[PDB]
Amino acid sequence: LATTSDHDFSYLSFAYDATDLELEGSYDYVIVGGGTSGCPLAATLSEKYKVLVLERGSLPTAYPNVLTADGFVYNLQQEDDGKTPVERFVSEDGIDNVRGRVLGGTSIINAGVYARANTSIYSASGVDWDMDLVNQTYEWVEDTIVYKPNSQSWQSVTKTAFLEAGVHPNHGFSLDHEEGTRITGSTFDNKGTRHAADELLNKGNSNNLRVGVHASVEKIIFSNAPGLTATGVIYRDSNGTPHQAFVRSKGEVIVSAGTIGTPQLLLLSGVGPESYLSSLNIPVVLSHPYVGQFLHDNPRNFINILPPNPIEPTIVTVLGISNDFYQCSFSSLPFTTPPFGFFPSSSYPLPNSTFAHFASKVAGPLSYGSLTLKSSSNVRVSPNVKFNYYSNLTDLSHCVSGMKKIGELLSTDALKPYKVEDLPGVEGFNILGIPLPKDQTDDAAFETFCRESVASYWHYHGGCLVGKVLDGDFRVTGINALRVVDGSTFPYTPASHPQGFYLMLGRYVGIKILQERSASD
Numbered sequence: 122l123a124t125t126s127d128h129d130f131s132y133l134s135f136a137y138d139a140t141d142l143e144l145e146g147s148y149d150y151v152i153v154g155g156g157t158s159g160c161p162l163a164a165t166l167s168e169k170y171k172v173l174v175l176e177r178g179s180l181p182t183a184y185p186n187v188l189t190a191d192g193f194v195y196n197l198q199q200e201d202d203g204k205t206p207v208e209r210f211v212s213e214d215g216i217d218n219v220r221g222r223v224l225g226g227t228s229i230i231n232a233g234v235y236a237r238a239n240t241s242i243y244s245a246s247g248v249d250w251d252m253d254l255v256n257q258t259y260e261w262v263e264d265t266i267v268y269k270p271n272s273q274s275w276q277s278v279t280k281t282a283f284l285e286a287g288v289h290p291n292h293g294f295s296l297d298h299e300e301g302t303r304i305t306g307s308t309f310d311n312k313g314t315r316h317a318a319d320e321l322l323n324k325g326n327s328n329n330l331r332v333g334v335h336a337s338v339e340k341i342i343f344s345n346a347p348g349l350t351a352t353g354v355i356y357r358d359s360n361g362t363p364h365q366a367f368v369r370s371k372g373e374v375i376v377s378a379g380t381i382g383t384p385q386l387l388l389l390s391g392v393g394p395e396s397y398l399s400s401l402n403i404p405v406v407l408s409h410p411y412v413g414q415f416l417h418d419n420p421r422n423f424i425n426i427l428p429p430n431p432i433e434p435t436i437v438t439v440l441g442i443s444n445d446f447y448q449c450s451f452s453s454l455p456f457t458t459p460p461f462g463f464f465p466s467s468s469y470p471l472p473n474s475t476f477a478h479f480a481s482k483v484a485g486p487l488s489y490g491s492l493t494l495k496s497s498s499n500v501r502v503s504p505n506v507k508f509n510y511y512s513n514l515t516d517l518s519h520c521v522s523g524m525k526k527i528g529e530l531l532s533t534d535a536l537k538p539y540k541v542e543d544l545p546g547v548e549g550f551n552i553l554g555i556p557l558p559k560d561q562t563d564d565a566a567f568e569t570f571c572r573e574s575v576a577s578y579w580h581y582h583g584g585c586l587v588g589k590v591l592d593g594d595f596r597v598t599g600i601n602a603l604r605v606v607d608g609s610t611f612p613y614t615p616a617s618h619p620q621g622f623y624l625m626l627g628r629y630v631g632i633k634i635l636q637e638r639s640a641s642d
C-alpha cells in the first residue's frame with residue numbers, strides 16, 4: 122500500500138505531444154493506448170528496452186478535475202467535445218456509457234475502487250499463471266497508487282446494513298475479492314487526491330520510455346504473407362499529420378486500447394472476420410472470426426434514496442460480495458446536470474438533495490454481444506457495441522437475487538433512520554427513480570424491475586478473448602510481433618471492480634515478455 126502524496130507527474134519529462142514526435146521512429150516496443158494496462162506494461166518493458174506509448178487523449182493536467190475524488194461526477198457531467206477525458210457512447214441496447222480518453226486511461230476517470238481478482242479465477246482463464254509473479258505485481262502497483270481509506274460515515278452505515286442483511290463474513294480491511302463484507306482499497310488517497318495508471322509510468326526508465334499524447338493510432342502495419350508480422354503503426358497528430366512508429370528485431374506492437382479501442386483498431390487494420398471486412402472493402406490481413414466478438418457488460422441495477430436528513434458525499438470503500446452479485450453504496454451531492462452514464466438515459470429525474478446510490482453488479486456476465494465499426498476508415502468515430510443485457514436468463518436470476526438483497530438492506534435497522542416514513546418492509550423511503558417491488562417474494566415483479574431499470578456498471582470487457590483471438594501468452598494468433606493486453610482479453614469480470622486485475626495484467630505480461638527476451642539472448 123502507498124502513503125498519501127500528490128499525484129506524481131515526474132513522467133512529464135518524457136511525455137510529448139504527437140506533433141513534436143518524429144515523423145518516422147524506431148523502437149523495441151510500441152504500445153497503443155496509455156491506459157490502465159498500457160501504462161504499467163510500458164513502464165515494465167522500458168526497464169530494458171526502448172518503448173513508445175501512443176495515447177489519443179490529453180495529459181491528466183489538461184483536465185484538473187480528474188485528479189480529485191470531488192471531481193468524479195464532474196467529469197461525467199462535462200459535455201463531450203471530442204477531446205475531454207470522458208468519451209460518451211450509447212450501446213445498441215440503448216444504455217448510456219462512457220470510456221476514458223486520457224493518459225492513464227479509464228483509471229483516470231473511475232470510482233477509484235481497488236480489489237485484487239478472485240483467487241479462484243486464474244485456473245479457468247486459459248492462461249497458466251505464475252502466481253508468485255502475480256502477487257509481486259499486485260504489490261508493485263499497490264505500493265504506488267493504492268491506499269487504505271479513511272473511515273467515512275456513510276460507508277460505515279452501509280457496512281452495518283450489509284452485515285445486518287447477512288452478507289457474511291466480515292473481512293475488516295482487505296483487498297481480496299471474497300464473499301462477505303469488507304472495506305477495500307482505493308486509488309484515491311486520504312486527502313482525496315486521485316492516483317492512477319499514469320503514475321506507474323514513473324516506475325519506468327526515463328531514458329528508454331517515451332509517451333506520446335494526442336496520438337490517434339489508426340492502423341497496425343504488417344509484413345507480406347505468409348509469416349505475417351506486425352512492423353509498426355500509423356498514428357495521426359492534432360495537425361492531421363500522419364506519423365509512423367516501427368518496431369525492431371524481436372520487438373513487438375502491443376495493443377492496450379481497451380475493450381472498445383482494441384477490436385476497433387484490429388478490424389481497421391484488416392484483422393477480423395473475412396466476410397465482414399470484405400463487405401467494407403477493408404483489405405484482409407488475416408481472417409480472425411472472433412475479433413469484436415464476445416463483448417460483455419455486467420448490468421448495474423440500483424435504488425436511489427433521498428434521506429430526510431442530509432448525508433455526506435463519500436467514495437466507495439465498503440463492498441458486499443455475494444457469489445452471484447457484488448454490491449456497494451455511493452453517497453453524493455445534488456445536481457442539475459446529469460453525469461452521463463450514471464443513469465441509463467438522459468430522461469431521468471435529478472436529485473436536489475443529497476442521496477445514496479445502492480448498486481448491484483451481476484457476476485460474469487453470461488450474456489454477451491459484439492462490436493462493429495461505425496466508420497470503415499475513421500478510428501475517431503466510436504464503434505457500435507451491443508451487450509444484450511439479460512439475454513442469458515441466469516444473469517436475470519442473479520439480478521433478482523441481488524435486488525432482493527438490496528431490499529433486505531433497505532429493511533435493516535441500519536437504514537431505518539434514512540426513511541421519510543415509518544412504513545414497513547422496503548417502504549417509507551423517498552426514492553429517486555424506479556422503486557423496488559413492494560412484495561419481496563414477487564419474482565416476476567423483480568424481473569420486470571431488473572429489465573426496465575438496468576444501467577451499465579461501466580466494467581465492460583471482452584472483444585479479443587484469450588482462446589478466441591489470442592493465445593495463452595496474449596499473442597494474436599497467426600501474426601508475429603503482435604499482442605493485446607487490456608480489458609478485452611477475458612469474458613468474465615475478475616472481481617467486483619476490475620482495475621486492480623487490469624493494472625496487474627499490464628506489468629505481468631511485461632515481465633513475461635522480458636523473461637522471453639532474456640531466454641532468447
Ligand SMILES: *[C@@H]1O[C@H](CO)[C@@H](O[C@@H]2O[C@H](CO)[C@@H](O[C@@H]3O[C@H](CO)[C@@H](O)[C@H](O[C@@H]4O[C@H](CO)[C@@H](O)[C@H](O)[C@@H]4O)[C@@H]3O)[C@H](O)[C@H]2NC(C)=O)[C@H](O[C@@H]2O[C@@H](C)[C@@H](O)[C@@H](O)[C@@H]2O)[C@H]1NC(C)=O
Binds near residue numbers: 487512513514515
Ligand atoms: C446462459 O449461460 C449458461 C451458463 O454458461 C448456459 O448453460 C450452459 O450451456 C453450456 C452449453 O453452451 C453447457 O455446457 C455443455 O454441458 C454439457 C453437459 O455437461 C456437456 O456435454 C457439453 O460438453 C460438450 O462435450 C465435451 C464434454 O464432454 C466438450 O469438450 C465439448 O466442447 C462440448 O461442450 C458442454 O460442456 C453447460 O452445462 C450449461 N450450464 C448450465 C449450468 O446449464 C446457457 O446455455 C443454454 O442452456 C444450456 C442448459 C444449454 O441448453 C445450452 O445449449 C443453451 O444455450 C446460457 N443461455 C443462453 C440463452 O445462452
Ligand SMILES: *[C@@H]1O[C@H](CO)[C@@H](O[C@@H]2O[C@H](CO)[C@@H](O[C@@H]3O[C@H](CO[C@H]4O[C@H](CO)[C@@H](O)[C@H](O)[C@@H]4O)[C@@H](O)[C@H](O)[C@@H]3O)[C@H](O)[C@H]2NC(C)=O)[C@H](O[C@@H]2O[C@@H](C)[C@@H](O)[C@@H](O)[C@@H]2O)[C@H]1NC(C)=O
Binds near residue numbers: 252253256291292293
Ligand atoms: C497471493 O496473494 C493472495 C492474496 O491476494 C494470497 O492469499 C491469501 O493468503 C494469506 C496467507 O496465507 C491468507 O491469510 C490468512 O487467512 C486465514 C483465513 O482468513 C480468512 O478467514 C478469516 C476468518 O477466520 C477471515 O477473517 C479472513 O478475512 C479470511 O476470509 C487467517 O486465519 C490467517 O491469519 C491469514 O490471515 C489469505 O486468507 C489469502 N487470501 C485469499 C483470498 O486466498 C496467496 O496465498 C496463497 O493462498 C493462501 C490461501 C495460502 O494457501 C498461502 O499459503 C498461499 O501462498 C498468494 N499466493 C502466493 C503464491 O503467494
Ligand SMILES: Cc1cc2nc3c(=O)[nH]c(=O)nc-3n(C[C@H](O)[C@H](O)[C@H](O)COP(=O)(O)OP(=O)(O)OC[C@H]3O[C@@H](n4cnc5c(N)ncnc54)[C@H](O)[C@@H]3O)c2cc1C
Binds near residue numbers: 377
Ligand atoms: C465511470 C467508470 C467508473 C469505473 N469505476 C471503477 C472503480 O471504481 N474500480 C474499478 O476497479 N474499475 C472501475 N471501472 C472500470 C475500469 O476503470 C476499467 O475496466 C479499466 O480502466 C479498463 O482498462 P483498460 O486498460 O482496458 O482500458 P483503458 O484504461 O480505457 O485504456 C485504453 C486506452 O487506450 C486509448 N486509446 C483507445 N483507442 C486508441 C487509439 N486508436 N489510439 C491511441 N490511444 C487509444 C484510450 O484513450 C485509453 O487511454 C470504471 C469504469 C468507468 C468508465
Ligand SMILES: *[C@@H]1O[C@H](CO)[C@@H](O[C@H]2O[C@H](CO)[C@@H](O)[C@H](O)[C@H]2NC(C)=O)[C@H](O)[C@H]1NC(C)=O
Binds near residue numbers: 241242300
Ligand atoms: C470466485 O471464482 C469462482 C471460480 O470462477 C466462482 O465460482 C465458484 O463458485 C460458484 C458459486 O458457488 C460455483 O457454482 C462454482 O462451481 C465455483 N467455481 C469453481 C470452479 O470453483 C466464485 O463464485 C467466485 N467467488 C466470488 C465471491 O465471486
Ligand SMILES: *[C@@H]1O[C@H](CO)[C@@H](O)[C@H](O)[C@H]1NC(C)=O
Binds near residue numbers: 470471472
Ligand atoms: C426536488 O425535491 C422535491 C422534494 O421537495 C421534489 O418534489 C421535486 O420533484 C425535486 N425536483 C427535482 C427536479 O428533482
